[PDB]
């Protein structure tokens, strides 16, 4: 038929994985974490775990510590899972979508963004689940995990 | 995390039943979508279904050219799905099946017919996959990522 046989056979493995997390607990966030860390473990590829502090003082440092703690806990669990290279990616900005698209993706250079279907940030310019928005707008592959 | 939570967070996640959604166009995103789905199905030994949704003839549109146009489009999409199935078998996927459906609302066909029948836990599609015949215009992947009850990867 019409497709190039050899090219269509080449394996595809994602080389640099970015997991985006919020502070909430739910089945989608658990499964997004497990997918990203299973992939990174099984194919021996780097994982970045990102969250974003939203622009609004012992209060601001407490909010910052909270985001840092959420990401640090996920990194610890990823290390326990056996992922060889995992790093925290805590970023700050006005609109989370732009922070991810304009700062995190270009700096960390992932080829896959993973996030749970429930992940959301209350002061994002567009309200609601960030995963499908990123699936539409990002220049890389995006999986929205449920 | 408490002990139970820690253990649950550690449990491997390997998708069990993969649904690849395709249109007739051969582009970078569709090639990579096919390669990701078949690499997953091969490396983890899980079933793959390869789906598309055909346009049907409209009983209120009667003319000499429309039937040929629609029939030839249907056969083209059937050919593309069959070729993807053969390529997946050549790739070494043990269980791969065609899933050709039809209807005017492709989102609804996938959500209400294909997913409940094939029972995938992951839907894969290229970022360019689109069905201009359908109710809603533009790339279907991000809409399915929003609406589906299962995980959806939009591949670029
Ligand atoms: Mg291990
Ligand atoms: Mg069956």
| CA nearest to A50, candidates A80, A14, A79, A92 | A92
Residues 6+ apart with CB under 8 A from A8: B31, B34, B35, B87, B91
Residues across chain B: 156
> Is B67 domain-assigned?
yes
By residue range, what is the domain housing residue B49?
Answer: 18-156
> Is B1 domain-assigned?
no
Query: What DSSP designation does B1 have?
Result: -
Interface membership of B25 toward A (CB under 8 Å):
no
Cα–Cα distance between A49 and B110 in angstroms, integer?
32
Cα–Cα distance between B105 and B148 in angstroms, integer?
15
Resolved by = X-ray
> Is A8 domain-assigned?
no
B115 Cα–ligand 2 center, Å: 12
Q: After what residues is chain A interrupted, C–N > 2.5 A?
A: 56
Residues 6+ apart with CB under 8 A from A62: none
> Is A4 domain-assigned?
no
What is the total count of domains within chain B?
1
User: Radius of gyration (Cα) for chain B, nearest Å?
Assistant: 17
Q: Residue A122: phi, psi to the nearest 5?
A: -70, -20
Neighbour-count burial of B78, counting CB atoms closer than 10 A to its CB (0-12 exposed, 13-18 middle, 19+ buried):
middle
Domain of residue A126, CATH code: 3.40.50.620
C-beta atoms of B139 and A136 within 8 A: yes
Phi-psi region of A109 (alpha: psi -120 to 50; beta: other; left: phi over 0): left
> Is B139 domain-assigned?
yes
> Is A102 domain-assigned?
yes
3-state secondary structure of A76: helix
Q: Which residues of A touch B127 (CB under 8 A)?
A: 141
Cα–Cα distance between A135 and B143 in angstroms, integer?
9
Q: Which residues of A touch B141 (CB under 8 A)?
A: 135
Going through B8-134 in order, the beta strands assigned E by DSSP cover: 18-21, 48-54, 96-102, 122-126
> Across the beta sheet with B151-155, what order do the strands follow?
A86-93, A47-54, A17-20, A112-116, A141-145, B151-155, B122-126, B18-21, B48-54, B96-102
Neighbour-count burial of B124, counting CB atoms closer than 10 A to its CB (0-12 exposed, 13-18 middle, 19+ buried):
buried
Query: With contact defined as beta carbons under 8 Å apart, do A78 and A86 qualify?
Result: yes
Phi-psi region of B94 (alpha: psi -120 to 50; beta: other; left: phi over 0): alpha
> Is B111 domain-assigned?
yes
| CA nearest to A23, candidates A118, A145, A124, A138 | A118
Residues 6+ apart with CB under 8 A from B73: B24, B54, B55
Question: Which helix (H) or strand (E) covers residue A106, if one does?
Answer: helix A105-108
Question: Which helix (H) or strand (E) covers residue A143, if one does?
Answer: strand A141-145
Cα–Cα distance between B40 and B14 in angstroms, integer?
9
> Is A3 domain-assigned?
no
Cα–Cα distance between A1 and A13 in angstroms, integer?
26
Q: Which residues are paired to A20 by β-bridges? A: A50, A115
Cα–Cα distance between A113 and A97 in angstroms, integer?
13
User: Radius of gyration (Cα) for chain A, nearest Å?
Assistant: 16
Q: Which residues are paired to A51 by β-bridges? A: A90
């Amino acid at each position: 038929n019409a497709m190039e046989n050899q090219k269509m056979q080449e394996p595809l493995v994602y080389r640099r994985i970015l997991l985006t997390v919020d502070e909430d607990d739910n089945t989608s966030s658990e499964r997004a974490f497990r997918y990203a860390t299973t992939l990174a473990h099984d194919y021996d590829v780097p994982l970045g775990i990102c969250s974003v502090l939203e622009s609004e003082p012992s209060k601001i440092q407490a909010k910052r510590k909270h985001v840092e703690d959420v990401v640090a806990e996920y990194v610890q669990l990823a290390e326990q899972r056996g992922v060889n290279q995992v790093e925290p990616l805590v970023y700050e900005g006005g609109d989370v979508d732009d922070v991810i698209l304009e700062q995190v993706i270009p700096e960390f250079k992932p080829d896959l963004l993973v996030t749970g279907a429930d992940t959301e940030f209350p002061h994002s310019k567009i309200a609601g689940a960030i995963g499908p928005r990123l699936a539409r707008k990002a220049p890389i592959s995006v999986i929205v995990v449920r």
